[PDB]
């Protein structure tokens, strides 16, 4: 599923991501934009053998199990495939654990490099929220 911008903002808000850990909804939509281009089926293989999954590109080294990242953890206690669903519940619940881990949204390199310190409210401008 390729979400629309305002559609994803609504779904993220319904799942309680807006202002979670102090991050406004615009930060989360911006992160998803540059992590996945709003595509729940996005995947990216990393040099260390891990894989990033889903609309927020959550990594198998720490957060989900894909059976092919030797020595990894599964802190969100989910198969990584669950992170590719058109329903974003699993991704949101796992993003809540990730953003609570100590470094906030700097856990998403694309957020730090492309969203942090920008006018992130622009990503929810004009949405019926
Ligand atoms: C939360 C999450 O999956 N973060 C990843 C991190 O593993 C890494 O720095 C890179 C991998 O492509 O992009 C993302 O920031
Ligand atoms: Cl915002
Ligand atoms: Cl594994
Ligand atoms: Cl959803
Ligand atoms: Cl923080
Ligand atoms: Na894992």
UniProtKB/Swiss-Prot annotation:
User: In which broad location class does this protein mainly occur, judging by the first location in its UniProt entry?
Assistant: secreted
**GO: which molecular function terms?**
beta-N-acetylglucosaminidase activity; identical protein binding; lysozyme activity
Q: Catalyses which reaction? A: Hydrolysis of (1->4)-beta-linkages between N-acetylmuramic acid and N-acetyl-D-glucosamine residues in a peptidoglycan and between N-acetyl-D-glucosamine residues in chitodextrins
**UniProt xrefs under InterPro entries:** Glyco_hydro_22, Glyco_hydro_22_CS, Glyco_hydro_22_lys, Lysozyme-like_dom_sf
Q: Could you say which residues bind substrate here?
A: 101
Domain spans labelled C-type lysozyme: 1-129
Keyword list, A-Z: Allergen, Antimicrobial, Bacteriolytic enzyme, Disulfide bond, Glycosidase, Hydrolase, Secreted, Signal
Name its GO BP terms in alphabetical order: cell wall macromolecule catabolic process; defense response to bacterium; defense response to Gram-negative bacterium; defense response to Gram-positive bacterium; killing of cells of another organism
Q: Which domain of life is it from?
A: Eukaryota
Subcellular location as annotated: Secreted
> Pfam families, from UniProt?
Lys
Q: Where is the active site?
A: 35, 52
Q: What is its EC number?
A: 3.2.1.17
- Family membership noted in the UniProt record: Belongs to the glycosyl hydrolase 22 family.
Which purpose does this protein serve, as stated in its record? Lysozymes have primarily a bacteriolytic function; those in tissues and body fluids are associated with the monocyte-macrophage system and enhance the activity of immunoagents. Has bacteriolytic activity against M.luteus.
Q: Any other comment in the entry?
A: Lysozyme C is capable of both hydrolysis and transglycosylation; it also shows a slight esterase activity. It acts rapidly on both peptide-substituted and unsubstituted peptidoglycan, and slowly on chitin oligosaccharides.
- Quaternary structure annotation from Swiss-Prot or TrEMBL: Monomer.
PANTHER family for this protein: LYSOZYME C
The name of this protein is Lysozyme C
């Amino acid at each position: 599923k390729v979400f629309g911008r305002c559609e994803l903002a609504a779904a993220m808000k319904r799942h309680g991501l807006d202002n979670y850990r102090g991050y406004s909804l615009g930060n989360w939509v911006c992160a998803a934009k540059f992590e996945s281009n709003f595509n729940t089926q996005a995947t990216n293989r990393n040099t260390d053998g891990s894989t990033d999954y889903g609309i927020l590109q959550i990594n198998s080294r720490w957060w989900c199990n894909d059976g092919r990242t030797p020595g990894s953890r599964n802190l969100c206690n989910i198969p990584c495939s669950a992170l590719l669903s058109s329903d974003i519940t699993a991704s949101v619940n796992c993003a809540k654990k990730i953003v609570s881990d100590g470094n906030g949204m700097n856990a998403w390199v694309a957020w730090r490099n492309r969203c942090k310190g920008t006018d992130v409210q622009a990503w929810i401008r004009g949405c019926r929220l």
